[PDB]
Amino acid sequence: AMVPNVVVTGLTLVCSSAPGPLELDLTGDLESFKKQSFVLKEGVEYRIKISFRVNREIVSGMKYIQHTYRKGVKIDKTDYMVGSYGPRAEHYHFLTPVEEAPKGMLARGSYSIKSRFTDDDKTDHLSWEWNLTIKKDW
Residue 86's CATH number = 2.70.50.30
Q: What is the 3-state secondary structure (H, E, C) of the chain?
A: CCCCCEEEEEEEEECCCCCCCCEEECCCCCCHHHHCCEEEECCCEEEEEEEEEECCCCEEEEEEEEEEEECCEEEEEEEEEEEEECCCCCCEEEECCCEECCCCHHHCEEEEEEEEEECCCCCCCEEEEEEEEEECCC
Domain that holds residue 55: 1-138
Alpha carbon 92 to chain centroid, angstroms:
14
Q: How far apart are CA 31 and CA 28, in angstroms?
A: 9
Q: How far apart are the first and last CA of the chain?
A: 41
Residues 6+ apart with CB under 8 A from 106: none
CA 48/CA 103 separation, integer angstroms: 18
Experiment type: X-ray
Resolution in A: 1.9
**Backbone angles phi and psi of 76, in degrees to 5:** -150, 145
φ, ψ at 106 (rounded to 5°): -70, -20
Residue 48 exposure: Cα atoms within 13 Å on the Cβ side: 23
Task: Provide the domain count of the chain.
Answer: 1
